Design a protein around this ligand. Structure first.
Ligand SMILES: CCCCCCCCCCCCCCCCCC(=O)OC[C@H](COP(=O)(O)OCCN)OC(=O)CCCCCCCCCCCCCCCCC
Ligand SMILES: CCCCCCCCCCCCCCCCCC(=O)OC[C@H](COP(=O)(O)OCCN)OC(=O)CCCCCCCCCCCCCCCCC
Ligand SMILES: CCCCCCCCCCCCCCCCCC(=O)OC[C@H](COP(=O)(O)OCCN)OC(=O)CCCCCCCCCCCCCCCCC
Ligand SMILES: *P(=O)(O)OCC(C)(C)[C@H](O)C(=O)NCCC(=O)NCCSC(=O)CCCCCCCCCCCCC
Ligand code: SF4
Ligand code: SF4
Lengths: 185, 115, 60, 82, 242, 238, 186
C-alpha cells in the first residue's frame, strides 16, 4: 500500500472517539435529528435555483454555438472559376479510418486528372475530419451543417453529384470557415 | 473471490486416457440427460430425439482423436457450452442456429456454378 | 501571436469547499420557535374547546 | 418392484431401439457390446433410456457398471423408485 | 447585461509579445540511464533466485521484462507477490500476442504493479493451441477476467481457473478473433428473418469488401537498427592490448 | 491514555486494524521464516536473499525493547518452567485449550526461541453473552442411545474439560509488555515498509512463500530451454 | 470562509433592489448563478477572429535554415534497443566480471581463451549448475553485486532528481477538515 521508506507522517489514524467524546451538544444533535435540518438546507437550495434564469434555448429558432472547425456533412468544392478542385490523388481514400470513401478516376476528355466516381458512405463515416486534413487542394470539406437526417439509408450514400451540389450550395460558409481556420492548419 | 456460476467446472488436465475416456462419457451422458430440459427452456418444436441426434453427431466428429491435449480442449468447450446452455444465457436464436434442419456430384456442382 | 495568459497571469479562482453554516438551519432556533408555535397553539386550543363546550351547553 | 415387471419393459425398450443387430439376442444375461452390438455412446443412451422409463436418476459411478441387462435389473431393484 | 464590478474583459488585456523561441533537442531515452544499472541488477537477481524457470530478461527504457517457462507460472508469481523486494500485489493486465511463425504461437504477457516500490514489471510466457498455462487466480483475484479474455480471444486454456468461459464474444460464437489467421470480418453475420421470425446466422457477404491498403507499405526500411544502450556493468570485459 | 495503540483500531487502511502485539509477532514471523529456509541448500540465492533480509529486519525489531521486558521475561520463565504442563501444546493442544471463555496459552519454539501465544476470550458486551461465552455444542444426547453415539457426542469430555472457575493447579499467564506508541513509530522508521501492521502482513506472506519455493525447487536447473525462435521479435540487424 | 466575491465571478449579476433581496434570502450571496456574460464570453466568436493575427510557431534549432542537419535531431532512429540477458551469459558475467567491474585482469592474449570459456561454460551449464559447484559463497557474491542485500526494484518518479518512490504525505490543508472520512494527500 503506502510508499516504501519512512511511513507517511501521521498516516496512522487517531484512535476512535467514543460516544461521550463527540463534542456536540445534545440539544444540537437531537435537534438536527428530529428537525431534518440538513435536508431543509437542500430544499432551500432548490428554491433559489427556482428563481434563477433557465439555461434553455428554443431550438430550432435558437441554435447552440459551433466553431469554424466544426465537422458536419461533406461537400466537394470548386475554384473561383467553377473548375473542380479535386484531382483524384486518393489521399483521403487512403487515410480514411472507416473506409467510407470510394474513388475512381481517369483522364478527362481534355486530358485533366479528374474523378469519375466519388462516393462517401455517410453511414460508415466517423466524422473525424482526417480526409479534409489531408487534402492537398482543399476539395473535401466537412460543412457546418448537422441537420440532414433522412428517411432512408440510400439517401445517405452520397455520390459526386450530391457532394458537388453540397459544395455549390454551402461554398460561402465553407470559404468563411477555411478563412477563419486556415492559419492554424 | 467471485463465486463461480451454477455449472462452472474447474479447468483441469486429463490424467491419462482412462481419465479422458470417463470424462467424455460423463459429458455425453450429461448432454443427453438434459435434452428434455433444453426443449422446454428454448421452446424447441422438434422432438427431443432430434436434439439427442445432434449431440451424438457433435461427439462423433471428435471420435478419432488420439491426443490427450486435444481432447482436453474439447472437454473444455463442451463444459462451457453445457454451462452456457443450462443457465439460459444463450437464447432461442442461438440454439436454433445450432440446428441446420455442398453439391453431391461434380456435374451438379458444375451446372449451378461452383455449388 | 498565440493564445497566451495575460502579463501577470490570471487571478485565483474559488475551489476550496465552501458550505457555510447559515442560521436559518440551526437546531436551537428551530426547536425554540417550534416550541413557541406549539405552546401558543395549545393556548388557543384551550380557549376554543372551553368556548365550544359552553356553546354545547346553550344548544342543549 | 417386481423382477419380471422391471425386465419386461426393458425388452420392449431395447427391441424398440432402432439399430440393435437382432431383437432375439436380448436375454436376462445379455451384454450390450458383445451381444447387442452397442458401442460406448449407444450403451450410455441405453442406461439413459432405462433411467427415463423407470423415472430414476442413475449416478455416474454406477451408470458405467451397467454393461449388461442383468446389471440393469439388479440396480433397478437396488434403487427404491418406480 | 449587468456586468460585475471587478471582472474586466480578459480578452481586452494586452499580451506581451513573444518572438524568437529556443528549444533544446532531447533524446527522451537519456533520462532512463540513471536506472539502467538498477533495472539490470534486479532482473539479474531474479534470474539467480529462480534459475529453474527464468530464461532471460530484457531492459528497454524503464521497463524490465522477465521471460519464463510456462511450468513456472505459479512459483514465479508467488515469488513476485510475496517477496519483500518483490511486493507486486496487483496484476495490471494479462494479454496474449500471436506469433504464427513461432511453434508456440501465443505469448502470454502479464503486467504487475508494486505500489510499495513504485515499480512495474513484465513477465512473458508461451503457449500454443494445445499447451495450457497455469492460472494465477489463486494469487490474484483480479486475474480471473483477464485469463477469460485470453481464452476467448486467443484460445489459451488456463489450468486451475474456476469458471473459464467466454467473456467478450457472442454466446454461440466459434473461433478466436485475435488470432492472426482469423479474418477481420469473421465468417458469419446475423439478420432478423421475416419467414422464421427470429435472428438467424448466415455466411458472410459484404456489400463492399474490405480494402486492405497494406500493400502500400514502404519499400524502404524507415527505422534502422537503433542503438545499444546496455551499461558497462552488464557487458563482458574486453581483452586489453599486449 | 495515548501511550499505547488500541488493538483493532482502524489504521487508515481498510480492513487493517491495530495489531494486539506487533513486536513479538514479527519475531515469531521472522524466526519461523529463518527456520523454514534451512530445507534449502546454501548455494540458493533465494535462501541467501530471504536469509539476509529477515536477519537485517530482525535485528531492528530487537533494537526496540518495551519497558520492563527484562523483569517480565524473568517472571515468565519461572512460570513456564514451573508449570510447563499447562502451556505444553502436546498436552493442551495448539489452540491453548478447549475452553475459549477463559484464558489460554501454549509455548512454541522457533529457531530455538521460545514463544507463548495466548488467546484472551473475546471481549463482548455482558447483555449479549450467554454462559460467559461458553461454546454451544447443542443439547446433550438423551434417550435410548448406542455407546458409539454417546462417544461421538463428546462423552470423554466430562473427564478432561475444566470448569473455568476451577483455578488452583494453574497460573495466570501475564503477557509481554508492549511498545509505547512512540516506539511503534520509531521501530517502523527503522524498518521503512509503512505501518507495522503492513510490515507484519508482508512478513507472513514471506513466511508462506518459502513453502512454495521449497516444493517447486526453484534453485535447480532450468526446466524448459526456450526453443529456437521463441523470443525473436521484429528487431533489425544491428 | 474560502469564498471569493461574487463581483469577480464573471456571471450575470442582480442589481438594485433584487440584489438587496437576493443577498437577504440566499445561503451564500457570493455564489454565482452560472449564467455567463454576453459581452465577454466567446465574444468575438472564433469565426471572426482575424487569421493574420495568429502566427504558427517555429523553434530556433528545429526550424532554423542554417544550424540543423536532420540527423542530429533524428531521435526516432536513435531509438534504444532492448538489452537482453540470458542465463548463458549471466554465468559469464559471474565468471569474469564486466567492463565496469572485471574479476581478473584478462591481460592481452591467453585472456581471450578464458573469455570464450566464460561464455561457453554458461551455454553448457546454466546459473543453477554454476552456483552448485562454486558453492554458497558465489551465491553470496551475487548479493555482493547489490551491496549484500537484494536489490530494490526501481521506482518511476524522478521528481526529486533520481528515480524513486513518490513520498505521499498528508496535505497541509485538509479540505474536509477532519469531519469527513476523506483525507487529503500530497
Ligand atoms: C413543517 C415544515 C416542514 C415541511 C416539509 C417536511 C419535510 C418533507 C421531507 C420529505 C418527507 C420526509 C422525508 C423523511 C426523510 C427522513 C428519513 O426517513 O430517514 C430515516 C431516518 C433513519 O433514522 P435512524 O437510522 O433510525 O437513526 C439514525 C439516523 N442517522 O430517520 C430519521 O432521520 C429521523 C427523522 C425524524 C422525523 C420525525 C418527525 C419529526 C417531528 C418531531 C417528532 C416529535 C417527537 C420528538 C420530540 C422532540 C424530542 C426532543
Ligand atoms: C438570527 O437571528 O438571524 C436570522 C437567522 C439567520 O441568520 P444568522 O445570522 O445566520 O443566524 C445565526 C444564529 N446563530 O434566521 C433565524 O434566526 C430564523 C430561524 C427560524 C425562526 C422561526 C422558526 C419558524 C417556526 C418553526 C416551525 C417548525 C420548524 C421545524 C419544521 C421542519 C421540521 C421538518
Ligand atoms: C403533541 C401534542 C402535545 C404538544 C405539547 C405542547 C404543549 C402542550 C401543553 C399545553 C399547555 C399550555 C396550555 C395553555 C395554558 C393555559 O391555558 O393557561 C391559562 C389557564 C387560565 O387562563 P384563563 O383564565 O383561561 O385566561 C383568561 C380568560 N379570561 O391557566 C391554566 O389553566 C393553568 C396552567 C398551568 C399549567 C401550564 C403548564 C404549561 C405552561
Ligand atoms: P467407446 O470406447 O466407443 O467410447 C466412445 C468415445 C467417444 C469415448 C471414443 O472412443 C473416444 O475416446 N474418442 C475420443 C474422444 C471424443 O470422441 N471426443 C472428445 C470429447 S469432447 C466432444 O466431443 C465435444 C463435442 C461437442 C460438444 C458436446 C455436444 C453437444 C453440443 C450442443 C448440443 C445442443 C445444444 C443446443
Ligand atoms: S484527397 Fe482531395 S483532391 Fe485528393 S482525391 Fe481525395 S478529395 Fe480529391
Ligand atoms: S471525416 Fe469521414 S470521410 Fe473523412 S476520413 Fe473521417 S471517416 Fe472518412
Amino acid at each position: 500500500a503506502t510508499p516504501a521508506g519512512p511511513p507517511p507522517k501521521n498516516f496512522r489514524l487517531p484512535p476512535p472517539k467514543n460516544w461521550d467524546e463527540e463534542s456536540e451538544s445534545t440539544i444540537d444533535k437531537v435537534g438536527k435529528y428530529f428537525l431534518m435540518t440538513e435536508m431543509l438546507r437542500g430544499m432551500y437550495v432548490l428554491l433559489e435555483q427556482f428563481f434563477r434564469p433557465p439555461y434553455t434555448i428554443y431550438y430550432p429558432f435558437e441554435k447552440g454555438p459551433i466553431s469554424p472547425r466544426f465537422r458536419g456533412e461533406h461537400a466537394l468544392r470548386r475554384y473561383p472559376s467553377g473548375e473542380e478542385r479535386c484531382i483524384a490523388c486518393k489521399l483521403c481514400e487512403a487515410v480514411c479510418p472507416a473506409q467510407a470513401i470510394t474513388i475512381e478516376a481517369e483522364e478527362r476528355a481534355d486530358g485533366s486528372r479528374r474523378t469519375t466516381r466519388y462516393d462517401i458512405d455517410m453511414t460508415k463515416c466517423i466524422y473525424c475530419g482526417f480526409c479534409q486534413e489531408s487534402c492537398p487542394v482543399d476539395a473535401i470539406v466537412e460543412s457546418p451543417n448537422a441537420e440532414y437526417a433522412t428517411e432512408t439509408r440510400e439517401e445517405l450514400l452520397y455520390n459526386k453529384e450530391k457532394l458537388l451540389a453540397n459544395g455549390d450550395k454551402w461554398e460561402p460558409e465553407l470559404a468563411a470557415a477555411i478563412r477563419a481556420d486556415a492559419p492554424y492548419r | 473471490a467471485v463465486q463461480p456460476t451454477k455449472f462452472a467446472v474447474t479447468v483441469r488436465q486429463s490424467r491419462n486416457w482412462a481419465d479422458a475416456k470417463q470424462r467424455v462419457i460423463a459429458a455425453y451422458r450429461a448432454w443427453i440427460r438434459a435434452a428434455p430440459e433444453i426443449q422446454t427452456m428454448y421452446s424447441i418444436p422438434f422432438p427431443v430425439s432430434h436434439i439427442r441426434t445432434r449431440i451424438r453427431q457433435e461427439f462423433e466428429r471428435h471420435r478419432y482423436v488420439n491426443k490427450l491435449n486435444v481432447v482436453d480442449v474439447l472437454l473444455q468447450q463442451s463444459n462451457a457450452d453445457f454451462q452456457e446452455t443450462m443457465n439460459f444465457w444463450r437464447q432461442q436464436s442461438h440454439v436454433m442456429a445450432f440446428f441446420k434442419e455442398l453439391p453431391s456430384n461434380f456435374i451438379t456442382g458444375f451446372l449451378e456454378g461452383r455449388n | 501571436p498565440q493564445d497566451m495568459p495575460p502579463p501577470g497571469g490570471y487571478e485565483a479562482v474559488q475551489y476550496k469547499r465552501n458550505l457555510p453554516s447559515r442560521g436559518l438551519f440551526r437546531p436551537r432556533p428551530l426547536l425554540a420557535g417550534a416550541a413557541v408555535l406549539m405552546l401558543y397553539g395549545w393556548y388557543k386550543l384551550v380557549k376554543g374547546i372551553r368556548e365550544q363546550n359552553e356553546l354545547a351547553r346553550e344548544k342543549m | 418392484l417386481q423382477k419380471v415387471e422391471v425386465y419386461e419393459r426393458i425388452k420392449s425398450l431395447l427391441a424398440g431401439f432402432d439399430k440393435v443387430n437382432d431383437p432375439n439376442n436380448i436375454t436376462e444375461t445379455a451384454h450390450f457390446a458383445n451381444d447387442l452390438g452397442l458401442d460406448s455412446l449407444d450403451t450410455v443412451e441405453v442406461v439413459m433410456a432405462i433411467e427415463e422409463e423407470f423415472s430414476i436418476e442413475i449416478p455416474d459411478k454406477d451408470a458405467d457398471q451397467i454393461h449388461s441387462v442383468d446389471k440393469a435389473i439388479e440396480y433397478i431393484l437396488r434403487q427404491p423408485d418406480a | 447585461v449587468a456586468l460585475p464590478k471587478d471582472a474586466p474583459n480578459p480578452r481586452a488585456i494586452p499580451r506581451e509579445p513573444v518572438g524568437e523561441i529556443k528549444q533544446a533537442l532531447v533524446n527522451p531515452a537519456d533520462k532512463y540511464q540513471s536506472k539502467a544499472d538498477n533495472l539490470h541488477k534486479y532482473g539479474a537477481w531474479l534470474m539467480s533466485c529462480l534459475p529453474k524457470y527464468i530464461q532471460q530478461f530484457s531492459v528497454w527504457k524503464d521497463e524490465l521484462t522477465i521471460y519464463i517457462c510456462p511450468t513456472g507460472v505459479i512459483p514465479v508469481f508467488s515469488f513476485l507477490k510475496y517477496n519483500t523486494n518483490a511486493e507486486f500485489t496487483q496484476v495490471s493486465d494479462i494479454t496474449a500476442v500471436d506469433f504464427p511463425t513461432r511453434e508456440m504461437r501465443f505469448e502470454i504477457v502479464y503486467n504487475l504493479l508494486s505500489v510499495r516500490h513504485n515499480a512495474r514489471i513484465r513477465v512473458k510466457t508461451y503457449a500454443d493451441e494445445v499447451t495450457p498455462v497455469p492460472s494465477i487466480t489463486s494469487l490474484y483475484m483480479g486475474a480471473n477476467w483477464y485469463e477469460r479474455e485470453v481464452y476467448d480471444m486467443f484460445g489459451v486454456l488456463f489450468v486451475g481457473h474456476p469458471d473459464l468461459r467466454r467473456i467478450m464474444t457472442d454466446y454461440g460464437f466459434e473461433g478466436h478473433p485475435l488470432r492472426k489467421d482469423f479474418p477481420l470480418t469473421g465468417y458469419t453475420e446475423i439478420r432478423y428473418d421475416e419467414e422464421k421470425k427470429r435472428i438467424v446466422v448466415e455466411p458472410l457477404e459484404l456489400t463492399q469488401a474490405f480494402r486492405n491498403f497494406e500493400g502500400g507499405s514502404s519499400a524502404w526500411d524507415q527505422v534502422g537498427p537503433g542503438i545499444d544502450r546496455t551499461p558497462d556493468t552488464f557487458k563482458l570485459p574486453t581483452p586489453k592490448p599486449e | 491514555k495515548g501511550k499505547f495503540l488500541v488493538p483493532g483500531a482502524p489504521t487508515g487502511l481498510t480492513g487493517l486494524g491495530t495489531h494486539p502485539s506487533p513486536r513479538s509477532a514479527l519475531l515469531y514471523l521472522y524466526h519461523s521464516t529463518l527456520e523454514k529456509l534451512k530445507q534449502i541448500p546454501e548455494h540458493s540465492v533465494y535462501r541467501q536473499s530471504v536469509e539476509a533480509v529477515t536477519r537485517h529486519r530482525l535485528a531492528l525489531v530487537e533494537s526496540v525493547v518495551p519497558e520492563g521486558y527484562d523483569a517480565w521475561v524473568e517472571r515468565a520463565k519461572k512460570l513456564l518452567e514451573e508449570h510447563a504442563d499447562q502451556f505444553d501444546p502436546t498436552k493442551v493442544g495448539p489452540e491453548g485449550g478447549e475452553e475459549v471463555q477463559g484464558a489460554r496459552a501454549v509455548k512454541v519454539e522457533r529457531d530455538g526461541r521460545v514463544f507463548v501465544v495466548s488467546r484472551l476470550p473475546k471481549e463482548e458486551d455482558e447483555r449479549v453473552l450467554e454462559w460467559d461465552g461458553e461454546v454451544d455444542e447443542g443439547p446433550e444426547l438423551e434417550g435410548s442411545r448406542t455407546l458409539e453415539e454417546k462417544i461421538e457426542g463428546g462423552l470423554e469430555k466430562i473427564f478432561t474439560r475444566r470448569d473455568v472457575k476451577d483455578t488452583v493447579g494453574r497460573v495466570e499467564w501475564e503477557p509481554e509488555p508492549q511498545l509505547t506508541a512512540e516506539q511503534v513509530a520509531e521501530l517502523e522508521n527503522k524498518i521503512g515498509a509503512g505501518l507495522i501492521e503492513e510490515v507484519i502482513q508482508v512478513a507472513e506472506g514471506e513466511l508462506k512463500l518459502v513453502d512454495t519455493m521449497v516444493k517447486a525447487r526453484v534453485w535447480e536447473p532450468l526446466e524448459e530451454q526456450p526453443r529456437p525462435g521463441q523470443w525473436e521479435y521484429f528487431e533489425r540487424k544491428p | 470562509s474560502n469564498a471569493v466575491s461574487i463581483t469577480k465571478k464573471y456571471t450575470v449579476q442582480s442589481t438594485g433592489i433584487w440584489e438587496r433581496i437576493r443577498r437577504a434570502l440566499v445561503i451564500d450571496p457570493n455564489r454565482s448563478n452560472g449564467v455567463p456574460l454576453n459581452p465577454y464570453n466567446r465574444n468575438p466568436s472564433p469565426g471572426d477572429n482575424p487569421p493574420l493575427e495568429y502566427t504558427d510557431p517555429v523553434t530556433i534549432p528545429a526550424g532554423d535554415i542554417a544550424d540543423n542537419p536532420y540527423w542530429k535531431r533524428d531521435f526516432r532512429r536513435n531509438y534504444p534497443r532492448p538489452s537482453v540477458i540470458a542465463q548463458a551469459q549471466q554465468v559469464a558475467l559471474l565468471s569474469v566480471g564486466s567492463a565496469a567491474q572485471p574479476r581478473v585482469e584478462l591481460i592481452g592474449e591467453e585472456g581471450t581463451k578464458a573469455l570464450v570459456a566464460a561464455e561457453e561454460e554458461g551455454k553448457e551449464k546454466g546459473v543453477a549448475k554454476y552456483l552448485e559447484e562454486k558453492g554458497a559463497e558465489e551465491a553470496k557474491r551475487v548479493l555482493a553485486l547489490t551491496g549484500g542485500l537484494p536489490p530494490t526494484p526501481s521506482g518511476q518518479t524522478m521528481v526529486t532528481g533520481q528515480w524513486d518512490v513518490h513520498k505521499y504525505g498528508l496535505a497541509e490543508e485538509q479540505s474536509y477538515g477532519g469531519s469527513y472520512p476523506c483525507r487529503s494527500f500530497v
